[model samples]
Target: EELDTRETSLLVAEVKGWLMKLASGKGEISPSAYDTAWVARIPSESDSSLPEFPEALEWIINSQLPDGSWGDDRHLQLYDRVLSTLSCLVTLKTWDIGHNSIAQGTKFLRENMIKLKQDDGDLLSGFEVTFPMMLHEAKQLGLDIPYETEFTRLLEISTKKKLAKIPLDKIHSAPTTLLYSLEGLQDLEIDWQKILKLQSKDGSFLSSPSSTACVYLKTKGRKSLQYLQNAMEDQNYAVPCHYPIDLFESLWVVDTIERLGIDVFFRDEIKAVLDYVYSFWTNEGIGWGSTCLVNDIDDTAMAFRILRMHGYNVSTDAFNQFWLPGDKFCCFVGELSHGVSEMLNLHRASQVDFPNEAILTKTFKYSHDYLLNVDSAHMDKWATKKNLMGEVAFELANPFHDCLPRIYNNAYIKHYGMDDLWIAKTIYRLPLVNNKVFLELANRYAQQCQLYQPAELTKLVNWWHSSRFEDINIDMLPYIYYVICATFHEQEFAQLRVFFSKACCLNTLFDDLMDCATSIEELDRLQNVIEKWDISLSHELPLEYRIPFQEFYNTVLVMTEAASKIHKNLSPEFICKYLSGIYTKLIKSEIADARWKIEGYIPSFEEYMENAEVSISTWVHVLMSILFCGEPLTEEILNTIYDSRPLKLDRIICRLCNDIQTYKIEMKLGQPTQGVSCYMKEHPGATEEDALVYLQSLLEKTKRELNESYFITHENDLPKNIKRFNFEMVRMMLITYNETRQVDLKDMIKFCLETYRTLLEHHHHHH
Candidate 1:
């Protein structure tokens, strides 16, 4: 469904307006009353007998809701309200302000304190210890607080369990997760001097206002006091749960818009977003915001994912910083408050990991398990509007490497684009990070791809049928169309998609003959036919080998005959002369694989990778692009086809991906093994499961190297269009086995062709 320009003109304006707001440093977050109450308690300076942030004091006094509670009323959270009201009551009581207002707060707490047992989105970080201890304080203060259920006791037990594993050595001297929730530790935090050293360079304790306030309540040092004063004045006495989330905001913003598929309008802005992200990127990774002292798994994971995907040379070692020996990757060192989003983001980052980056493999394992164990109800402690179990399962099933963009984008179009909700002690909205703006734009893009070049698609399909391909295999014609159109569906590139479709369809059948030949003579005879490049030589071949040779010959003839219809100045011979010989290199690699297996000797990972590169045949895909793109077969073209980085990547990664899935299926014929077998061959003690892990990590890395090719600079640069063409082919091959698992892809292919026919007739007469 193509969107009417008139209908979307206003929509574009709305998106552009949102983009402008994001470009500004300002971001929306609901203020935190619990944090403000902490600031309200900062007593008068030495000279003046008034609090430093009198405004924050006034905010605490005046902002109580009609319900006589202090919290986010727009999005009601019992935990947030109870804590906010309790913190205000405690501050007022300490200041000797006796009033019935405290009584109203006490009543709200009595009614809502039961919610402490069912901690959820309403509960802030460190709520377990914080609320329980606060309740303890209320009892001692002689306040009318609820003491009915064992909810606080349950929290105390959970708190003890959490702290049991954390070494005190980690907490006392370092800026660790313990620092973020130091306020909740009422009685035990006796060493004020040693702990003060752990505060951030900005003098705040991990940008947690409540933590800073409570820490200051103990220290009374100038630095922590200065930190609270600065935070108070910065937002005019208002405070966010966390601070300086420029990097965090930048990543999720770019991530959201791109998935929405409305990013075409925001290309410059997206570039700027990445540029800003790369600017602050560090060897240790980043936190939620810029100017942040604490580096965490949450922001680092998102940063690694987008940065590496865009070709930044961010070292995987950055992730190693979070890896703990014999333990899973934590958000921060000694993190007491990690949840699904942290692990989920880390899992997402590991998807883009490169080979030999074992920590990412470990990170993937750790986070994947974490995701499964954590209930959906317990997920996304950092955000309120979040993914469901089905969403998590979808991503887990579809690794980024195996992504079918047309399908995945369709899934994400629904998942990430809904209205967003952020948690900062209380819930608030931030439309920039999660939104529905891209849905219309992506739909329009899909519509154009479907509707373009129908006549050329028709001509190409008829020609393939004329060659008796549909008779040999019912799927031959449309499968090619599905992949080609799914990727190269542009009127200007119809020549590329149509011709490449027939050529690749023939190439697949030919590969089967080469890899799965039933007899030695069949392989020899077909290799002879391919080497000779002569259609007449098919007479000497058996029917099985003969069918494949004839198909290859037919694809050549069809390609030559078809290119004339579209090419303005190039000869079919110019393109096919280089491409027809693609079979020799491809066959040579297969022969090597056959030799290794026949002799029962597995090759080294490096040697097998060298042969596997050619066997996967991305070079074939790249060579075919000479005609698909209608560009010259220059030295550059030949170089790219043979030794090009993307050509190598497509060959290796695509082969690795296939081998990982169907290696056993491939070995029934006594063929050479894949990366997994070679790995196990070298390590005699390794299990098949270990081989899968090792091989998966290899594919992940090779995919990284391949994507990295797109971002190479200066003399290493491949033409942008050529890179895109190969990338499309790489992804096309990736989903080859997985497409049918999700949707009836054959039906989708038919719809394109079937739709193309009707549209072509309209286009024919209109022209």
Candidate 2:
């Protein structure tokens, strides 16, 4: 609990500046030499007053590293350095200024150019054309750049022969990956006009300034020059490796903000980001930007997830483009090898699915399995941040539906790897992806939430104590109070948290007596339900049962009556009918427990579970709490309690989250069944620990099924908020419920709150 009021308000004010800049699409990115090399070589007609783009030429010259190289200095990859050196050397020689760089350029080139003898790990985005052409030109320019041109080549066979195999008409008539390196294919026989027609709206070939600059040099096209010029003007220096990553920027901005647990802080901005991504989203699927014709699954899969999460109408059908006819899939077509990031996103997207998308289902399995291999192999292409294995493990520990924003932010905040840069030809930072602002804000919020917990604990603990029931002695009141506070953090929902906590404290107290303490007649008399409309029936129960029963009746009376003032639709009669019936499900399960113990009745796993899922009463209490949770409870959602398919799966999920944890204690005490017990009975080979792990997998698989029912495509007209409720209700229980790693969740949350203020103060010092 770290954020002081004055400091947190200042942070609230400071983030508005970044929000305005990003929302308007003026997100500043660092420049790189790879794109600028292409920019530098754009020539003007002989003796024309076009001035010949001195700015592009100046950018290439000025951006050189201390070692006389012109690649991403942040990384020392030889391929990038060699490619940039040779291209810059060619530009100088082409412009008759070869003397300016011949000294240091030749030295750096000769020493490292031989590294091409081995594969230098940079993506081959047209390296065959781009690199070979640079090698061919440097030699022709009479500059001494050393290389074994044939053996060190990507392949020894025929370079010109491969070009001949791809018909010229095919390259010119349509868009393809070949457009990226079209500048170096000048020796080929082709129609330039047909190829130029395929240029992007920004007037570059797929927005590659290098390829466009080549076309500009050959034809003096104003459109190609304009794209390059626009890029140059933004920096007054070199341009970023990729121009116009507008769609990519917007999608990740929304996603990062949401996962930071600060989405509530940027409600309007997140909506706009989603709307921006959805505006240019296409049937063929999007690339890094809206105008890119060549689609890859990386951007498309992430956009698909962000779009659907925000309630936008995007189709699952469009995702099929990435899925091949066989069991395997690729990020881009003809990719013989794959990386983890694209499949990680596809794995995330597939989790929120509809029923009939079997292709997507198969692809999800393929991607899910593919990612584990990546994890095992210590390889991931897109997570440039750091030991992405840690990130992948975080997802493993906390699945999407199971993760609370605070828990995820707390887990990943330490590992945000803010210093790491991405490779887009050369290194650049997408600050929106690794936003320091959002992380700081989330830390403050977690701080405030946790600090509020102790105060809330006192009030809630006092709440139980003031009830003054001698028979009730549940020591887990602080833990229960924490659950309610963590579940609903807003002070506006103070009354709701109060009601939810009291219901649980009272439910837990009752569970104790019913679980092991009560006798046959005492339990039988309690369940008899002598009269519904009178107070005497409650009065007739033994003191232990009667007092908690009276407390239960009084608790529901207060909750329903309070919300009744706010919600015009809900009647007092409604809570009474629901409470009377909902209370009986748990009681029936208690009677089953008593019978099971005395008669040694271990019912079949299915038979025990059919009632036990509801009998746990976690789902019932949560659904009841929803009525007063301050969200609008539509009639469709109310109907979902009885009928929706998603609700059943949700309840079973809720039951299991409780079941695995409480199994040993409850089974040893001779109460009703737990999930591990059911699993062990179902599969005699599994031990208790093994059954717990088995039940955990069963929980995740059922969550995927729950997702299908949660979709709008389901038969019921259940509103989306109900789906939200069902997911959150079950998810919150998992985070708060104690298990093998409950202390870890608590420790992370405490660490976030306690240390957040110090981290923020340090952040402000830098600013």
Candidate 3:
């Protein structure tokens, strides 16, 4: 059944309204047992005899699980549970109350501490220091927990080495990450007065409730108490792990919606959220919260990527704080450990670099290698998804430039982890960032799109037969499959899909025939007819030449007739003239290429690239698609396609991406000149490996230049949507030419088609 528009709109409108309300406030996150325990331990300022927040103590007592654990019950990780349970037990022991509850919690901790011997994964942010500090407090209270075990001693030793990495004086001066984990430094810290100078304006230490509570307990600071009082009241007894994550929630909600592929429907809502985040955007970058004094790479990288892509004038200098000296990067200024999530975000941010952004150039390689080498079992302290390894591997295998929106959303919907949890002092959930409703909306939207593609493919197949393209054995499905995966499958872009698919099929037919032609005269004969736009000369050519040339001439006539009606301002004659000019350029470029092969000519690297750009047919297909899509076309846009620097660089990237993957096959097939071979011939003593390295670097540099095109502001600028469409066109080429993932193309076609089939059944009853 078709989804009722009103019903679908209500579902989407509800989510958007919920987000709009959340955008104006702090984040909505689950309670944190470990942080609340620290708040519960604070003594009253008037009398050190009673606990400051007795309601927090009662809340922890009632929140414990049946098995006597206190952390996230869904994820039964030993480290998180042990830390939360221990902190709660110490708080109860500090108040000298809840003796029976303390006994049960102690039993749980003792049984779980021994399990840590076999489980060393799921490391938390400051587990090493915080666990030992809590255990020492337990021993002082004469609790019956395992106090002097081998694991505990090892943790104490390791915590000292970790803390020693950052100087104490530096921690006391700057607002470093050490401030967030101040409660964990119970035995080693001695500078409360100095650390107080580095507190955030909200009176919390890095917006950490537990860290702020610990400082207030010792120094009796008025601001710290005020921060804790507000945080406690905000949660109604149990404080969050972090306070005021307005920046984090707004940024992540937009990212999630975009990834789910429902962003198109929520453009107005998303822009409001982006505008809100952009106001808080700073040169030092942002943290999870708006008022946070310390910044991390995860949030900063995510913000930089989102803001820059949305046309904000964010500078690359925002990443300067995270860069280290030796071509390496860290999450925080003086961080002790790194997490997979932060590195993954950094790798993504680096790919969207503008030209001459040296920091991103270095950051890309460093973050890429870091993610590649990471163990699959690595658990991050910040967040976890249903398939972390799969997500990282997919991105690494398919870089951001090559991943089309439809293809990405298909994979993401399945592995989206709708119930994914974040790890802080204890595990917590953020509903706005990871909701099941977004998943359902994306799946339905994907299915709704499939309703028309099969019909379009039917029309395409009939046209293929009517034009006699099947007689030449140019497989039609593969060409249309590229169209299906690379562009929007929605009903609105149906004409563009049909036009581009035929263009690809025609380009392939001509290129293959040119390569296998018996002689130069045979190629020139067909080329001459196409240049003349005279199908009357078609009968003068041979059988092979007659079939393809007539079809090529007919497709141009049919497309221009349709294009003129859609464009309204242009006439069929005007469109046909421009269309024929591009087709002639394509044929002339191929004929030059065929001449080189026939004469065994090896052009220099520069010479080959110049001819290969036109021969690649990238710009021709994109320009035609622009015309078909009914985007604003002007004489200026047409001239820029040939004369613009970014346009030329875009064509070069497509050509090299194809050449690098097909060079070995081309060598075996007796092609005379390719980018790889030409480079080896031009550079003295350059090996095949060296040639590939040079070409790969050239491809990467060209990608950077094309990325800069999206940010350019000039009179000759292509419309922003056309520039983005051209970029997606370039991305389609990258994915199509990728060598190792040859089977991926077939799998994606199957995936794209079957995706609709499953959803058809899914909505039949599953919904």
Candidate 4:
């Protein structure tokens, strides 16, 4: 399939425009008839006999559906429809107008209300509490509606159960989540003054128009009246269930676009979005809206991860507000149940914490345990979709550190529900955040990769044959396969992938030669040539040393030259030093490792790791990635990233993982300089078994260190991109390095290629 660059660019432009044009910190959502009707019932402040928002009442009257229902036309949800119709009917009856519309809505409710018993649709947030309250109002108003039924009996019982769970003291004394559903508390004990004390700083109760309306009606609080009047100011039709969702919408839009793997197209737009989010950032955490006084875990955790990943200076202390006295974290202050998605975001946010952030440590454990044990069929309090189960499962299996971009993106593309809607006082969909256009763009981007990679592989093989690397007795496919799987597989980054695979294959040859094929004398000569940075001496070496030495020499020169062209801001001298410097380090570390073996020297576990980590070749690959990916290659930035603790931990992890899988092979070959041997020698009485256990535990600690290192270090000390690149390499090595099944990797490569092909073909046929 042809790449849809033009189409993708157009769509990306459209999305960028949407983001740029976004205003008022409120998101675009369908008006909630249920909430609007509740708003319509409010009597005027000046005149108690008249409605305050007559337009709101008129909007409700004119907004009735053809089928006599009041709900989203695109979806047939019995609970949403019946609830909305009943609320509208009650509002019309209260105004003593739209009698014809009331009769039709009453009929719609009577016919559809019974269907709620058999309807399998997810309940809107606080539906049970509010629906019962509305039904009681209908009774007081003397409206002709079915009051007694099987569904009504079960609903009332469920409502009673929910009410009993709320601590009445918390509601009156604090701003609980119950504030969002204040209209549902109509029949509860009197505490209007106490409840009004808990109103949001913006004068609304949790940004709920209906709930604020209820407060205004009961107490005639001037603040509540002002909030309602402002909500109705520019609205000719009706008000939304929740307002000022600017923070929620912007944060989620960035998250969605990034996850969909289309962020590359809107780099500036995304930066602008994050800048806005950061401006509103707080130590107590942020809510769905910047104006909202109360914060929830879902919005806060998502913002924390996204902001930190972009190098924002957010503190772990922000999560303290969400923490309960126990080990668990709650979504809202008084949330009775935690949603799956909320816990999922927390689990992810916990992964990016700095070292010794105890809050995140507890967060990780608690959320991980909850996600592991929660019912697979449990619905999230915030959203309803067909694929959340799959998304959660994927996230649990592959934590942030272990995830590969292409693989994660594929999983995201598969599981993203284009038809999904978020739950609130009423169910609504954020089109910018969840839309078919985004999905189409994702699928097309993936299709382009599928078409590009095979050609890239072919070129790599051609280079392999031309360079006479087959004589080195190593398979290029496996090395390049790792390159494709571990590194960014995007078509635009072809140079980076090629440079990475070439360096890795060359290192593999040199390492194999030093370990088994070359004599110490040959290695000494090879090392001398590499250090001298001269291919002129290659003529004097054996064929094995000559072939790889010349290749290494040429790769360094060519890659350095290639990098210099792309990074024009960097001087030629610095580029050479940056690229050549890493290769030199790799050579020196490898030769040192071989010298220890030849001299029969047993290093301390620490000393062995200091050399062994570089010899594993992850640092070299990671550093080259930084250069090729276009980080300004300064000596200071280079030194900082190279010397970062997380970078070292990642190297240690890669080297130890390789040591474990290759320990038996090395032992059979009479090599005792491997990681396990070094540990055993360090501990006089320790056996290989003991060393293996110790090394495995050390690897675990190192991984945790790597995770923390990403968050703890200031971006000024080490760039976020550099940290991310190192961690990505660390993750790739975990899956593809050492003795991981070759066939498994082969299968993964096959799957990556075919998944895009299938997507392309399927999309083509549909068109």
Best-matching candidate per lDDT = 3
Candidate-wise lDDT, in order? 0.69, 0.68, 0.79, 0.77
- Which regions of candidate 4 deviate over 4 angstroms? 1-6, 21-24, 157-170, 234-236, 377-383, 472-486, 489-492, 518-522, 525-542, 560-585, 598-600, 623-627, 631-650, 660-673, 685-727, 738-767
lDDT of 4 by residue, 1-767 (tens): 23244677688778888777453354566788998899888887679789988998888878899889887777878778877887888888988999889888888877776666744677677787888888888878887778878988887997798778767777878777778888988878848888888888778989899899888888888888887788778455488888768888898888888888878678888887888899888988898887797888889999999998876888888889878877888998877777788888999888887656789889999999998997776545234675887888888877675567777787798888777876778776778787777788888877776676666665555566667775654354555565454457656667877777788888888888777734477777767777776778888677777887788877878887888798787776787777777888898889888887877788898888778888888888888878777456666776677777767787888887888777767677875636777888789899997888887877767776776566556545566567667777887787664333333346435644454445446556433
Q: List the candidates' TM-scores in order.
A: 0.75, 0.77, 0.87, 0.86
- Measured by C-alpha RMSD in angstroms, how accurate is candidate 3? 5.5
Q: List the residue pairs that clash in candidate 4.
A: none
Q: What are the per-residue Cα lDDT tens digits for candidate 2 across 379-493?
A: 5444467556766666555556656655566666666665466754445677667655666787776676666555555555555555666444435554555556655665665
Clashing pairs for predicted structure model 3, backbone only: none
lDDT of 3 by residue, 656-696 (tens): 88878777676677653367777888887998878888878
Clashing pairs in 1: 244-289, 245-289, 354-701, 355-701, 417-435, 496-628
Q: On a 0 to 100 scale, what is the lDDT of residue 394 in model 1?
A: 71
Q: Which ten residues in a row have the lowest lDDT in candidate 2?
A: 751-760
As for TM-score, the candidate ahead, 2 or 3, is 3
- 1 against 4, candidate with superior TM-score: 4
**For every model in order, what is the number of clashing pairs?**
6, 0, 0, 0
Q: Which stretches of candidate 3 lie over 4 Å from their true place?
A: 1-7, 43-58, 61-69, 86-121, 135-178, 187-189, 377-384, 474-476, 600-610, 635-640, 668-671, 674-694, 711-716, 743-767
Superior candidate under lDDT, 1 versus 4 = 4
